Amino acid sequence: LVTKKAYNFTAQGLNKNNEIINVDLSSFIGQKYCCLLFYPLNYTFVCPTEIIEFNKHIKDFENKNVELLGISVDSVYSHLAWKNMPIEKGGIGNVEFTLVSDINKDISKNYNVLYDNSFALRGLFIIDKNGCVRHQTVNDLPIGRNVQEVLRTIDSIIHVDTSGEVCPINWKKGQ
C-alpha cells in the first residue's frame, strides 16, 4: 500500500459536532494530510484509552494540517453511543474529530486490515496531500497506539515533503 494511491472511500461519518456527514477521502487532496486510525469495537479488543489520548492531542494534528479519521466497521449509531458513554463506563467522550462508519467493510478490506470479514485490525495510515500512502502500521490487536510516536512519524513525512532529504543525519541538522 505504501507508495501507492490511497483507496478513495465514501462513507458516512459522525463529526465533532455530532453531525452525520459524507466523508470522501479525495476531498482532502491538495488540502490536508490524513491519518486513518482503524480499530475494533468488540468487547474483547475495544480500547477507548487510545482514542481518548488521540483526542487529548487533537490540536497537534491540527497544527500539522492533518485530518484525523477514526474508522471501524460499526454503525453511526454505535459511534454516537460510544461518544455519549461515560469514560468511567468505557466511553470515549465527545471527541473533536470524525468517526467513520465502514459498514460495508470495503474500507478496511482495501487497507488490508479487515479481519475475518468481521472487524478492523489496529491499523494506522498516513496519507499525503497528493493522496499517496506514506506510512502503514498494523499493531498487535491488544496494543493501543502511542500518539506521540504517530506525531513524530507525521513530522518526518512533513520534513521529506518540504526538504526532499533522504535519511537526514541527526547531528548535522543545525549546520
Next chain:
Amino acid sequence: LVTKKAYNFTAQGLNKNNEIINVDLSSFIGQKYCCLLFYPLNYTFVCPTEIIEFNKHIKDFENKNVELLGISVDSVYSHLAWKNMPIEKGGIGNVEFTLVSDINKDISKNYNVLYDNSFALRGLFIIDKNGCVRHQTVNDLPIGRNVQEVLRTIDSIIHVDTSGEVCP
C-alpha cells in the same frame, strides 16, 4: 499479515562472524521472537545510519530474546561489501546480526514489501515464538526507522504474552 502465521523462508545469510549460513525462519519457533528488518540498498534510498543504530542496540534485542534479521534483495557480496565499507563512505561496519539475501525476491514478495519488482520497502515485522506475525510497519522510503520505538513495541508484545492484558 498480522494475526496470521509468518511466511516461512529458507535463505542465505551473512552472520556476525561473516560466515555465509542458512537462515530458516521456522527454526526460531518455540525458541525466540524475530524482528524482520527489510530495507533498500538502492543508491537513491540507502540509509546506513538506521542499520548502524539497530546494531548499537543489539544487546537490547538479545536481552529480549529477539533474533534481528536484516533482509534486502541484494547478494551476499553486497552485504559483505557494505559491512567492510568505511562509515564515512556510506558503510555499516561489522554489524552483529544476520543480513539475509532475498536474491529471488520471494521473501519481499510474500511479505508485501517488494517495490516495482525491484527492491524491498522499509518494512518491519515482529514474529512471536509461535511463528505468528504480531506487528507490521512500512515506513516511507526516505525515512529511517527509530530503534527505540521498535524496542518499545517489542516490550509491549512480550508484556501481552506474559500478562494477557488488552489495552494496558
